[PDB]
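Researcher: Here's my situation. A collaborator sent me these components and asked whether they could plausibly form a single complex. I don't have experimental data yet, so a predicted model of the whole assembly would be a useful starting point for our discussion.
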Amino acid sequence: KEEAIFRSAEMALVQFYIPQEISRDSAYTLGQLGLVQFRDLNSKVRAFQRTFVNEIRRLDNVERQYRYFYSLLKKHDIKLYEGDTDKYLDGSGELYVPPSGSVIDDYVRNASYLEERLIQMEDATDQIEVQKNDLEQYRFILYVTGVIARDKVATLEQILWRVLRGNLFFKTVEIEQPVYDVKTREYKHKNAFIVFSHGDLIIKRIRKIAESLDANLYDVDSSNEGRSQQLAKVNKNLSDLYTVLKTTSTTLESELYAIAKELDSWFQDVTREKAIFEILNKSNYDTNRKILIAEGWIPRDELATLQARLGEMIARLGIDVPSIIQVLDTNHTPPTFHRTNKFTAGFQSICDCYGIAQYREINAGLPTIVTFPFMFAIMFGDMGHGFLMTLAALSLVLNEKKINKMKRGEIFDMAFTGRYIILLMGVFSMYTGFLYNDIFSKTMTIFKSGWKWPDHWKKGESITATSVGTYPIGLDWAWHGTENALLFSNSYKMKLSILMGFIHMTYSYFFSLANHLYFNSMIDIIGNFIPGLLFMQGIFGYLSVCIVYKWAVDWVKDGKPAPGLLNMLINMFLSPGTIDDELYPHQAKVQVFLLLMALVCIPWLLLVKPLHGDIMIHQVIHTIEFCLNCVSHTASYLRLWALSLAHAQLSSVLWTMTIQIAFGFRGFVGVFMTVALFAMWFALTCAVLVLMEGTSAMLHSLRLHWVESMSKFFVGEGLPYEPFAFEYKDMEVA
Amino acid sequence: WCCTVLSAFGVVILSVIAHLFNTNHESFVGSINDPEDGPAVAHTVYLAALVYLVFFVFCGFQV
Amino acid sequence: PTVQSLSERKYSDEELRQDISNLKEILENEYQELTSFDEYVAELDSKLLCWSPPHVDNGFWSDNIDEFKKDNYKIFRQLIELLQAKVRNGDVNAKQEKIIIQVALNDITHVVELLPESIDVLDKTGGKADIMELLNHSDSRVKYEALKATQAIIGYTFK
């Protein structure tokens, strides 16, 4: 027996007893299952008192070693080929629950050994740098000698002729290729700094000046035979050092490549072990007694699966030790878990981003999944725009496997998570456009237009059409470019938005009644549900009924003047009625009675709820807030019209610009211009309209949702459930 | 690559416009304010669609 | 290392904890063997070396380096010549002989960093050149040890 999205979500409390020896295996099995949230019974103590604190420190050291390995791989541009293998491990963990293994100490020792080769490679790099410095001396070829980058030879010569004002010869010789510098981290053209002078003090001063001039001096002998012998020795040493450095570099590269073959897998395993240790530390345990005894959170539906998995683990365990769980009662608030299907997880996340629902059974926030696409559509309007964004959502949904494979992205991750919310939004928008006769501000007139202008339209003079019937669906096909069209559409979506909003509010309120009815809360129901229903019905539902009636009665044929809906509301609010016209002779009296009932319902909010108080101030504040919020939100829902008209006018203006750019004179040059004009219109429409208007309108519909719908029934915060499954990230070492 | 979708959408839109102009719907050449040369509108839209299809072919890539 | 890892692991029995402590105490025998520079010198004179903790005596204590310094680097030079002859003997291809050669290469690398006099003696005796030539050993561990020895020799050569 499993429960879906129907009502305040389901959860349960259970205590799992396990043997000490099989603690690691049970933890690995639970993490692979990831269907429990262990209560932090042992976490009441400080972190320094954790049972696996030393193991936690060892895992942290292993993580530091893995981070150093990743740093080395980045420093040598290793491919990290194990990243592909890590995806299979995450898939293996999600599907078949592979055993974690008890070789964690072996991986720890391997990490220490890898750090040993890391230090060896660092020493090899230092030796290579020293040899590169030594190779500079090899440039010496046929008194103080040195080498200096060519950029400072003239300055050095001027300093020498100034400080050593006497005569001192110089033997500048150019270097064929640049040599890398340590601090400068660059290779620059250099020149020889051979200089000869008399006097030991003068030689010391010259050496000091050269050292101040960022020079590296050399002791090459002046004797031709001696210089040749020294050069031969230096060449032999340089050849040996070059061979040694090449071998060391090859060995280091091979070791790094070999490590990269399993570096990601080892890191994922270390992360899993660290998570297991952290869970164990939070889990209750004892030293003398049999370890691994604790409680947690688990759904009722998952009990049988948990028992079967535990039995399988016990069979796989090296010792026949039973492992089961016990269900116990506790007044501490349980968590809440929403059963997320692949195409409703996005809706659930959007709904619960506001907060955490109360506990009960099944799962909650469901109506948002249907309402949000539809309310976004009711303001999105355009059939063509809705179809285009539905096609985009389909393209982003059909490739879910590739989408999961691809990087989440900064913004695309939210979009990818919405690969199914966007599709429903597109379908609803396409339907609304099938009503709103505007593909892109265009009434295709699929059906028969019910309106007809007079028989002979004037040559250049305006006329008023006449109709014999209503349109089968959507706006009447004759309303395209009509002067009246703006006012008629406005008067249309006034009642459209008002009625849709009142329907949404009343349905959410029904949800509210359902949530109250799940609990007992008899006083709560009597003091909150019935009188609020009386308010909103007897005022705003009466207004909606009047809006419907003014459409029901053919005031043109009946001859009775149509009363103003706003006028009727004003008369009801600050008069006993008797408007210039009325829906019905009783409807005036009925409206008066409904207003009287709504007024009388205020003390019901004020005092029926306490029924026993100092806390009644909160109840009074909540009642005032409820009344004001109902009024404000039902007034607000015309903001759906605001967005809808904005979209329609924007589409009309964009098409007007497109037509003016494209049509022109329909010539060959005109066709050339239109070729780019159509693409420019499509780009502008896509970017501005689709990318923005649609995202904004989804935000607007969601905002209306949290403002009104959930504000009607959301009971407040709660405990969010945790799966405690292994992350299987194996990435983002930073 | 990316421009191929744009070219295809433009070709489809221009083809629909040419069909409407040939049919002389209430919109486009139907409006008196708009030029009434419906055949000219259809010809212009058809040639624009041909250009857009050429752009689609040019943007088409195999691998 | 296995005993160290076991001591790192948690003990579920008091008797197990006592046994772990006893094993840790008994592990002092390895330390006692390592400090026996005479034992290490005898093993070097012995035809076989097992890379025991005595093989790290120079790192463990300067006493091994001081002993090897004797007779003007000759204590180390004799072992270096023996290792070079064993390499030239042609039996090093054997796996056990490969392990022995790896131990000898590690000892040579430790000696080279121990004192530049040993490096000078090896260069004079031709052992350093032979080791550099044989640095491309077939065995991966032997190759790494020979590379370390060459780097130690080269590092002192350029210093």
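Model: Some features of this prediction you could bring to your collaborator: Chain B touches chain A through 24 residues (CB under 8 Å). The two ends of chain B are 10 Å apart (CA to CA).
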